[PDB]
């Protein structure tokens, strides 16, 4: 349920997940967060 600060960080996150990274890992490595709601903070 991912949320990233910009598109460079977004690509970071998707590639991280695809090559085996857990949610918390990918959030840490790509400066992203996970929410239980339908939208992210600006
Ligand atoms: Cl996970
Ligand atoms: Cl991991
Ligand atoms: Cl997280
Ligand atoms: Na993964
Ligand atoms: Na984990
Ligand atoms: Na982790």
Curated annotation (Swiss-Prot):
Which molecular function GO terms apply here?
Answer: toxin activity
PROSITE patterns for the chain: THIONIN
Q: Could you name the domain of life of the organism this protein comes from? A: Eukaryota
Pfam families named among the record's database cross-references: Thionin (PF00321)
Quick check: keyword Ribosomal protein in the entry?
Answer: no
This chain's function reads:
Thionins are small plant proteins which are toxic to animal cells. They seem to exert their toxic effect at the level of the cell membrane. Their precise function is not known.
- Stated family: Belongs to the plant thionin (TC 1.C.44) family. 4 C-C subfamily.
Q: What is this protein called?
A: Hellethionin-D
**Organism, as annotated:** Helleborus purpurascens
């Amino acid at each position: 349920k991912s949320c990233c600060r910009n598109t460079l960080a977004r690509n970071c996150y998707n590639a991280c997940r695809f090559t085996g990274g857990s949610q918390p890992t990918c959030g840490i490595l790509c400066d992203c967060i996970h929410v239980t709601t339908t939208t992210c903070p600006s």
